[PDB]
């Protein structure tokens, strides 16, 4: 249906408080949150979460809405085109629990996301999971189920970088090559997987899928990537300009140094 | 999920109901690739006999493009409505499978067509299948290609995408080995700068040292 | 969004610079690689594990 | 004058400006200067008339300014080879044409311009660092 | 006052027609506004003039052609003030050498 | 090609080889191979150092300074007319006849960015053919002519990443 | 026992608060350690600030000598830099925010401001100043931080900086050193008059136990962004305010020239940042061309 671009501000806003919560009560806990982003006909995008104030009455547990209202007029005065998507909680697959605490959250918002993340995961992926709200009629009553969806990764420099900054933990030129040394070596280590599939599948040592090897003929057409004409004068331009920019800075490092210099030699042969 | 459902409801079937179920195969719409249901030993079998001509069809459709139908169109059995259709939309596959800026006159010759109206209804309409991806260009006469989906293989093709993913992976090696070199050498230069940086600043200040006498 | 000219006659929409363009088809190119070795991945965890044990510990 | 001077009526507004022309040389504190004034209000005109235009019609702007096509010529001439105007003249179909200065070009050329000068005056200079150190000069003997 | 009234329903009027275009016919001007090619023409140059209008008109092709494309304009100027100071901060050091 | 190391053999030849004057068989062949290769400059003083009684002896010599003044004042009928008019012993002859090939690309080259439409009559004197000769082989090229009238229009026909650290390095000293 | 700073120990906070060791060495604070949630939110709002200088409140609390950085939450004022204490301006909010914080298990005290100077370098200016004084005086312990969200994005490494004042009539003794940084000439004279009034704490980061291990698993869907992201069309606009700012130094160089202690230096240094990361913005695209459109047939 709609398409989800996820930014990692909210799974460290999840991860933060789950482990808030472990920490100051020495047992893990399943907490409950609330997602705020924009969204432009069917592409929705997360950006920012914030927690929300659960009460447990007997076996079950209610969203207190008037600490929800509270939390939405603080936010709209920082964030004003941010607005409500969904919930976000921590666990496995999507229990009865969930589906009850679904209803109450859509009954402020018509179709709310939902979002679970594992936070003991057993996988080699992200364990984040995002779900909608599906209703039908079966039996003779309304049951509402769960759809999952595929999220992607959103872009933006500042969020990248502060990434990285803090997934690192620790001359100019050999530390931005560093940084553009380990996306190529994840690329080529998967290009190279794929070799080795492909003519593992043509030798014969597994089944004969034909899904991926049609998969990995759309992959090998899809090279060379937009070399068209007018890119290949786009391309030069920015090339000639940073050269122009360049040659600059040049003359303007060979002027200081005749400047120094200048004033050096008019000390020692000075005869005035 | 339809090429898998009519391949169960063919685990058996055979002669009349086979090609009966062939043509149903190729007329259901989403069904762009055939090549489980070519797989499949009584589908191939049907070489010896009377009904090679629907696995000559079938290899038309898995492999072929619109203008094979111009040159076997009296040998083939009559094509349907739809079925002209998919393999017109076939053919745009194909095409935007080579090169990613598909001109006019190409489009038309190939898919047989006379007007332009008719031929971007078509483009269109093959787009909101989600087969291949695009923008048309009318001023310059291009149909741009952004995605496209993978047809059928034969078993000689693939030493192809051995080919072209050793080339990428080739790439990847060299452009990390020279990134690793561009990084020593400039580390190099550095270190040598400082240096004689400082090895001048020592004889300088050697200089004044001894200049106190 | 788009601006007509009357001359000819064309009404034009947005235009899709090249750099950005060539920038997106780099994502989809990567998503595709992405995709292709999580379908692998799946579809045979034995010799997957293998394969990934064959270049990590190379 | 001044009312269809600003209405961007250029036929009959200098017509009536030649019509008091020998009025004014009789003036004693205006005569030296009416050669200065008609020649700077014309001036003035022709960059007002070629300023909506991209692509102006030299017959139509001769016929507007009471003159021929062969002295508007030389009039736009005159005007273009300083920075008054940024036109070219067709002289085919006789046609003023506005011209644009591609900023991108202009730039390349001028640092290429920048780039070569400055390292004439540093090997200039490193060879006058070179003759002072040396202390070469010409005896008056 | 009723030539003062009637020309300022003419300029709202084409301000809000050459608002999507960036290429425009004047004859096509002619037939919104019940005026003639050389009446439509001079209330052009009018408009131009006085800052309301952001165009140029053609007169041999009887045209109007907006302005709309705007290029890096910035850069462009920054490179060359930086390239005209180097030129004189480059012989203001030299001579230093006299 | 060859062309060019023959003449600095030549050079050669006339530096160190010689007491002074060198033999008319090189002088001729050196002045000769500046004209091929378009250094009239050179040419000039060439003929203005030869010694006069090579001259007065070795007349061809004076044959040759014969095409090089049509190259001077540019006549491509005069090129062409004067190359035929002398001829020598075996070492002019494929001299001038890659002269021959290059004045007639030169011309070509000329009549193909500098006219626009040009008479058959004027581009036949150019080129240096038969007008009907010329106009039946220009229509190849692609050059549409304009019979009944003869008005023939020309028509136009790996280590960048080093380099890049080495400019960064530079900078950042 | 990464996750041992996550505990909050109240009991030891008010022992520590209530002895005030920092009352008697002006010098006292030296490190700042920062969780990695604190920082992506202080720099995600600093991006969205625009152009213009936002700013907002952080929590945490004091360990020995070091200040501990947990989270952090924008503050709706508008018009920072200009005016001396403007969080006052939302401190009704203050009140808002935080009691309802305590309620969902964030149980750490105010511990200190931050805003963003986008374009001109991490440091303290007049009003700054002023503010970090009066916050000091009634806010104590605290702490100012000063992001640069537009160098962050052009230099490729993010541009922090935690700084506390000297009290008022108090003389610093030498610490000189200075390391350079490029500030623009309208905005040259507010570093030079507040230079010796603050100090910059020793800023370091840390993260949880879980929060590796969603980074490392993020690392596979997260390697796209990295080559098919242009850094030469995102910062167009700052290569050219720079350009200007450096073609204006070079007037007041060449005025001196002709006669505020050699400008020509300081103006090459700035010429060489700005070519070296304009450099470093081709080098990528090189790459991505040798790697995407070379692989043909
Ligand atoms: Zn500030």
Redesign the interface.
């Known amino acids: 249906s709609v398409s989800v671009a996820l930014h990692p501000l909210v799974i460290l806003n999840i991860s933060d408080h789950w482990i808030r919560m472990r920490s100051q009560e020495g047992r893990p806990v399943q907490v409950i949150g609330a997602l705020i982003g924009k969204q432009e006909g069917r592409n929705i995008e997360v950006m920012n979460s914030f927690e929300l104030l659960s009460h447990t009455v007997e076996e079950k547990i209610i969203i207190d809405k008037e600490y929800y209202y509270t939390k939405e007029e603080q936010f709209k005065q920082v964030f004003k085109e941010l607005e409500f998507l969904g919930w976000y909680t921590t666990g496995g697959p999507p229990d009865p629990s969930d589906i009850h605490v679904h209803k109450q959250v859509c009954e402020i918002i018509e179709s709310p996301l939902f979002l679970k993340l594992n936070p003991m995961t057993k996988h080699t992926d992200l364990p984040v999971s995002v779900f909608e709200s599906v209703i039908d009629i079966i039996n003779g009553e309304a049951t509402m189920l769960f759809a999952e969806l595929t999220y992607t990764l959103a872009t933006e420099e500042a969020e990248r970088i502060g990434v990285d900054h803090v997934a690192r933990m620790t001359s100019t030129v050999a530390e931005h090559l560093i940084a553009q040394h380990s996306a190529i070596k994840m690329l080529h280590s998967r290009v190279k997987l794929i070799l080795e599939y492909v003519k593992a599948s043509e030798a014969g040592e597994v089944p004969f899928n034909h899904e991926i090897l049609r998969e990995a003929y759309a992959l090998c057409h899809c090279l060379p990537v937009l070399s068209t004409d007018k890119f290949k004068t786009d391309f030069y331009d920015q090339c000639n300009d940073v050269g122009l920019m360049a040659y600059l800075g040049t003359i303007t490092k060979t002027c200081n140094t005749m400047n120094q210099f200048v004033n050096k030699f008019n000390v020692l042969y000075d005869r005035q | 999920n339809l090429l898998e459902q009519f391949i169960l409801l063919a685990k058996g079937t055979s002669g009349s109901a086979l090609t009966a179920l062939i043509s149903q195969v190729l007329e259901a719409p989403g069904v762009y690739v055939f090549g489980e249901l070519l797989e499949l030993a009584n589908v191939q079998e049907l070489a010896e006999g009377a009904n090679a001509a629907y696995l000559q069809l079938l290899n038309l459709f898995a492999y072929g493009t619109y203008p094979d139908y111009i040159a076997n169109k009296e040998s083939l059995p009559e094509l349907s409505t739809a079925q002209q259709n998919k393999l017109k939309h076939l053919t745009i596959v194909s095409l935007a499978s080579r090169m990613k800026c598909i001109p006019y006159s190409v489009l038309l010759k190939d898919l047989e067509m006379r007007n332009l109206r008719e031929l971007e209804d078509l483009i269109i309409e093959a787009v909101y299948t989600d087969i291949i991806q695009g923008k048309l260009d009318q001023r310059n006469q291009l149909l741009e290609v952004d995605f496209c989906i993978g047809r059928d293989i034969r078993k000689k093709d693939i030493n192809n995408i051995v080919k072209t993913l050793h080339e990428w992976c080739d790439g990847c090696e060299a452009v990390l080995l020279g990134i690793e070199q561009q990084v020593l050498r400039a580390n190099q230069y550095k270190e040598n700068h400082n240096r004689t940086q400082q090895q001048v600043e020592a004889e300088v200040t050697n200089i004044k040292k001894t200049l106190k006498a | 969004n788009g601006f007509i000219d009357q001359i000819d006659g064309i009404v034009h929409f947005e235009t899709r610079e090249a750099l950005p363009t060539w920038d997106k088809q780099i994502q989809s190119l990567c998503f595709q690689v992405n995709n292709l070795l999580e379908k692998i991945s799946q579809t045979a965890p034995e010799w997957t594990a293998q394969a990934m044990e064959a270049q990590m510990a190379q | 004058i001044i009312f269809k001077f600003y209405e961007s009526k250029y036929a009959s507004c200098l017509k009536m400006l030649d019509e008091m022309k020998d009025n004014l040389l009789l003036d004693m504190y205006l005569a030296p200067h009416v050669r200065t004034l008609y020649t700077q209000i014309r001036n003035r005109a022709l960059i007002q008339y070629f300023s909506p235009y991209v692509s102006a019609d030299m017959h139509r702007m001769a016929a507007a300014f009471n003159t021929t096509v062969a002295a508007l010529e030389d009039e736009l001439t005159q005007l273009i080879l300083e920075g008054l105007i940024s036109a070219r003249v067709d002289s085919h179909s006789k046609i003023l044409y506005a011209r644009d200065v591609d900023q991108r070009s202009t730039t390349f050329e001028k640092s290429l311009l920048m780039g070569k000068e400055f390292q004439r005056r540093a090997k200039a200079m490193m060879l006058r660092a070179a003759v002072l150190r040396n202390q070469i000069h010409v005896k008056s003997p | 006052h009723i030539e003062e009234l009637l020309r300022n329903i003419r300029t709202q009027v084409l301000i809000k027609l050459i608002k999507p275009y960036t290429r425009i016919h004047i004859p096509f001007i002619s037939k919104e506004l019940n005026i003639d090619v050389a009446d439509v023409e001079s209330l052009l140059v009018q408009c131009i003039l006085d800052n309301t209008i952001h165009g140029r008109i053609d007169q041999v092709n009887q045209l109007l052609e907006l302005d709309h494309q705007k290029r890096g304009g910035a850069r462009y100027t920054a490179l060359d003030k930086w390239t005209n100071q180097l030129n004189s901060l480059n012989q203001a050091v030299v001579s230093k050498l006299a | 090609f060859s062309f060019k190391k023959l003449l600095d053999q030549c050079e050669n030849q006339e530096l160190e080889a010689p007491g002074g004057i060198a033999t008319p068989p090189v002088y001729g062949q050196l002045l000769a191979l500046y004209l091929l290769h378009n250094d009239m400059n050179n040419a000039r003083y060439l003929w203005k150092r030869i010694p006069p009684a090579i001259k007065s002896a070795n007349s061809e010599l004076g044959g040759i300074w014969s095409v090089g003044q049509r190259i001077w004042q540019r006549d491509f009928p005069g090129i062409y007319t004067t190359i035929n008019a002398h001829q020598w012993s075996e070492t002019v002859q494929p001299i001038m006849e890659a002269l021959r090939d290059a004045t007639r690309r030169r011309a070509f080259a000329l009549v193909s960015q500098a006219y626009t439409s040009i008479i058959a009559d004027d581009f036949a004197a150019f080129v240096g053919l038969p007008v009907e000769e010329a106009v039946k082989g220009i229509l190849e090229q692609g050059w549409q002519a304009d019979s009944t009238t003869r008005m023939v229009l020309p028509r136009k026909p790996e280590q960048?990443?080093?380099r890049?650290?080495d400019?960064?390095?530079?900078?950042?000293? | 026992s990464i996750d041992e700073i996550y505990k909050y120990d109240k009991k030891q906070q008010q022992e520590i608060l209530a002895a005030k060791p920092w009352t008697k060495d002006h010098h006292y604070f030296k490190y700042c350690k920062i969780s990695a949630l604190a920082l992506l939110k202080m720099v995600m709002h600093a991006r969205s600030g625009g152009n213009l200088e936002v700013m907002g409140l952080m929590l945490g609390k004091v360990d020995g000598e070091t200040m501990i950085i947990m989270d952090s939450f924008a503050l709706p004022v508008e018009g920072t830099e200009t005016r001396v204490n403007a969080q006052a301006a939302a401190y009704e909010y203050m009140a808002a925010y935080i009691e309802n914080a305590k309620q969902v298990g964030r149980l750490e005290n105010a511990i200190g401001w931050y805003h963003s100077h986008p374009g001109y370098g991490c440091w303290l200016s007049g009003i700054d100043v002023s503010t970090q004084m009066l916050n000091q005086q009634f806010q104590e312990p605290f702490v100012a931080v000063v992001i640069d969200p537009t160098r962050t994005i052009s230099a490729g490494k993010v541009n922090l900086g935690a700084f506390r004042t000297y009290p008022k009539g108090y003389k610093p003794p030498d610490e000189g050193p200075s390391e350079y940084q490029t500030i623009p000439l309208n905005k040259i004279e507010d570093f030079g008059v507040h230079c010796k009034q603050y100090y910059a704490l020793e800023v370091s980061y840390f993260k949880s136990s879980l929060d590796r291990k969603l980074l490392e698993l993020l690392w596979n869907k997260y390697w796209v962004n990295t080559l098919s992201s242009s850094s030469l069309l995102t910062n167009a606009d700052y290569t050219t305010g720079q350009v200007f700012d450096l073609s204006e130094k070079l007037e007041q160089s060449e005025a001196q020239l002709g006669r505020s202690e050699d400008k020509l230096a300081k103006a090459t240094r700035d010429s060489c940042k700005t070519t070296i990361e304009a450099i470093h913005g081709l080098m990528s695209q090189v790459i991505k061309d040798k790697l995407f459109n070379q692989i043909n047939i």
């Open positions: 960048q990443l080093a890049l650290t400019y960064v390095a530079f900078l950042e000293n």
